[PDB]
């Protein structure tokens, strides 16, 4: 078969070859293309990148943490996933003028946007039951009842909430589509750290589509990844040139071990990645 | 591995839906053929992507954008300019059918114009003084381009979930993202739902135009218009007219000319724009 991974590799090539140079956040530098899209097939496999070891336990735990509606970094850290701890640091929170917020409070990030869109954020402990739009449940509801719907959209980019977030979201919006009882997802990702971020991003949304499919009684179709600003940190070029030399191996398969009724009831234990045989880990730093 | 450029992209999308699309139903009975997820890149470099395989309604494109820019949500303000495309959705019947019986006819709700200029604001009606309210996204986009051209956050939103149930229609165009590269301004549109026969050609012209405008206001050269689709659909009653469109030879895109310097985006007038070398094949009729 033609490996969907090649699209990611192809994209990294194309940026190495045609990308333009810019000044990054803090010192490094970047190579950027604007506008990309790749189609990742979800039928009888899972797009977990094989040319390097992807941190799946990160993927799964963080997704469940979004679904939990959590905005507290420690709730995820308690699971052994540290990716958001930097962002909820005492220092880091102060550096964004969040002096009054408790360590770990990330503001209205994905968990909140997904489960309580439009609600007025207070803090990471507040009860937000019945508050804001529960986009994720409405997406699930609409999928079950109206599979032709052209408006099954979940938004995480909220202009009002931006000054309040500990991290501006990479992922502006998702759109779901049903075709002959297959569920497709398209993510508009406004900023893609191609070396570090994107592989994990692909798995994350691929895993979301598996989950929503599973509860609406459908089959995973395609994940379409669309990028706005797709960048490579100079820092990643060398480890990436080596990665481009690796040959992908068949995608693993994802197992859902019990029938789950609701999106809220999923647990880590319910997911087994089978046959994940990656090439050795690559540590991107920047 | 050369990509197709200009109009062939769109002709290739059409073929793709005709050959590979899947039959789906709609709220009328007509039906569509449908594909999910496409992208095309229309160079705006010394040319303007107004389709040639059929004459496009250029005047309408132009007037509709001017209409968005001044923050109008009254279909009659556009109407009085000789462009009717929003009239139906502002009619007494369409309004009653949406539960807005208290609305004067022509009142569309918080559609593009409101969203671009007064985002986050409380929509009251179409005659209301909104100035000073909501986020002027359009002016912020221009300002950010001028002050941090490298910004990765230059997004204009129109899909507001909270405003959706007050809108005549949910927007086809969810969001725009801008990008500055080397003194060239690019724009990517996420169009959640594309009517490929009737809407898409107009849609492309529309957002290429907005790109040309903002590029001008900020002293940049237009770069690319990247068109990204969610649901790309062809209504069954357009298959035949589109089959005819596919046999036609696309001729080179026209150039767009801006005839004076303009300082603010609000000052553009219809007279500031001129399409040149527009050599389209004849109008093809497609019914909504
Ligand atoms: Cl139209
Ligand atoms: Cl002429
Ligand atoms: Cl002719």
């Amino acid at each position: 078969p033609p490996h969907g991974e090649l699209q990611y590799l192809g994209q990294i090539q194309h940026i190495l070859r045609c990308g333009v140079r810019k000044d990054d956040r803090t010192g490094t530098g970047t190579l950027s293309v604007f506008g990309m899209q790749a189609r990742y097939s979800l039928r009888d496999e899972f797009p977990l990148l094989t040319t390097k070891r992807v941190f799946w336990k990160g993927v799964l735990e963080e997704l469940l943490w979004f679904i939990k509606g959590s905005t507290n970094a420690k709730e995820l850290s308690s699971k052994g996933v540290k990716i958001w701890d930097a962002n909820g640091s005492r220092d880091f929170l102060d550096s964004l003028g969040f002096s009054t917020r408790e360590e770990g409070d990330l503001g209205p990030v994905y968990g909140f946007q997904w489960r309580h869109f439009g609600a007025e954020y207070r803090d990471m402990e507040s009860d937000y039951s019945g508050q804001g739009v529960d986009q994720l449940q409405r997406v699930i509801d609409t999928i079950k009842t109206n599979p032709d719907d052209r408006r099954i959209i979940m938004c995480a980019w909220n202009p009002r909430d931006l000054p309040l977030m500990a991290l501006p979201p990479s992922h502006a919006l998702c759109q779901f589509c049903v075709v002959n009882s297959e569920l497709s997802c398209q993510l508009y990702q406004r900023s893609g750290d191609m070396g570090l971020g994107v592989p994990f991003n692909i798995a994350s949304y691929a895993l979301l589509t598996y989950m929503i499919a599973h509860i609406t009684g459908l089959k995973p179709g395609d994940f379409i990844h669309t990028l706005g600003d797709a960048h490579i940190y100079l820092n990643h070029i060398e480890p990436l040139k080596i990665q481009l030399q690796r040959e992908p191996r068949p995608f693993p398969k994802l197992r859902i071990l019990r029938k789950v009724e609701k999106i809220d009831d999923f647990k880590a234990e319910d997911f087994q990645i089978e046959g994940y045989n990656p090439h050795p880990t690559i540590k991107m730093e920047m």
Side-chain angles (χ1 to χ4, degrees), chain A residues 1-16 18-24 26-260 262-273 275-285:
Chain A
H3 217 291
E5 187 149 9
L6 299 162
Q7 278 172 134
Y8 170 83
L9 300 191
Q11 292 181 340
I12 274 64
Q13 284 184 209
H14 185 95
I15 306 176
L16 285 171
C18 311
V20 311
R21 171 130 176 262
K22 283 180 187 145
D23 296 320
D24 86 319
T26 48
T28 324
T30 218
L31 298 170
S32 307
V33 170
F34 179 67
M36 271 160 151
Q37 177 176 97
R39 185 174 307 256
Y40 297 92
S41 178
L42 307 171
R43 328 182 159 78
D44 294 298
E45 50 174 58
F46 192 82
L48 188 68
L49 294 211
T50 73
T51 61
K52 82 183 180 158
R53 194 169 277 278
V54 175
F55 190 49
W56 173 250
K57 187 210 180 44
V59 182
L60 173 50
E61 298 281 357
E62 186 204 51
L63 192 32
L64 302 169
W65 173 78
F66 297 160
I67 294 170
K68 273 154 63 179
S70 178
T71 59
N72 183 342
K74 311 170 97 59
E75 266 187 66
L76 183 56
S77 196
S78 92
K79 305 277 187 188
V81 181
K82 184 202 80 201
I83 71 172
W84 290 84
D85 289 343
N87 310 70
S89 299
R90 180 74 261 143
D91 272 19
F92 190 77
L93 284 178
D94 297 338
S95 306
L96 293 140
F98 298 134
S99 60
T100 47
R101 307 219 290 233
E102 274 325 302
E103 187 160 47
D105 191 345
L106 301 169
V109 299
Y110 299 106
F112 187 82
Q113 293 310 334
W114 289 11
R115 305 320 298 263
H116 307 283
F117 175 86
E120 209 78 42
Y121 195 85
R122 298 182 301 274
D123 65 64
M124 66 161 188
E125 308 280 13
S126 323
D127 193 345
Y128 301 107
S129 280
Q131 303 201 214
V133 187
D134 180 340
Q135 300 182 99
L136 177 57
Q137 196 33 67
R138 291 198 193 185
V139 155
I140 290 157
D141 285 0
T142 305
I143 291 168
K144 302 188 138 199
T145 58
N146 188 30
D148 287 351
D149 208 305
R150 297 201 289 247
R151 314 155 279 192
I152 315 169
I153 289 155
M154 186 157 63
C155 291
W157 195 265
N158 185 0
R160 185 207 41 163
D161 285 340
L162 294 199
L164 300 193
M165 303 191 216
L167 178 90
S170 297
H171 308 115
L173 83 62
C174 287
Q175 180 175 13
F176 300 85
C177 182
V178 183
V179 344
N180 279 302
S181 68
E182 284 186 4
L183 174 69
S184 278
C185 184
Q186 175 169 198
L187 169 69
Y188 186 87
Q189 167 163 17
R190 58 105 203 165
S191 208
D193 182 308
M194 297 289 294
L196 189 88
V198 166
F200 183 115
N201 301 142
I202 289 167
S204 172
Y205 288 81
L207 173 55
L208 177 60
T209 314
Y210 259 81
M211 292 198 182
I212 298 176
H214 183 94
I215 99 109
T216 56
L218 296 184
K219 281 278 160 84
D222 285 322
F223 171 60
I224 300 79
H225 190 209
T226 295
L227 292 165
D229 176 49
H231 50 100
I232 287 176
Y233 288 103
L234 310 181
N235 283 342
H236 301 168
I237 297 178
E238 274 291 311
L240 272 158
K241 295 201 157 183
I242 289 147
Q243 186 184 344
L244 271 174
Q245 192 85 22
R246 297 185 180 171
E247 211 176 17
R249 294 151 167 177
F251 267 146
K253 273 149 133 88
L254 171 57
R255 286 171 190 6
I256 307 172
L257 306 176
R258 103 199 140 95
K259 149 141 214 218
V260 185
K262 272 148 205 182
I263 194 42
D264 293 289
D265 309 340
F266 277 110
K267 300 288 160 278
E269 308 103 59
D270 299 330
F271 303 89
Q272 198 207 281
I273 279 283
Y276 182 54
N277 186 16
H279 285 278
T281 298
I282 309 195
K283 264 186 72 190
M284 325 268 177
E285 34 161 21

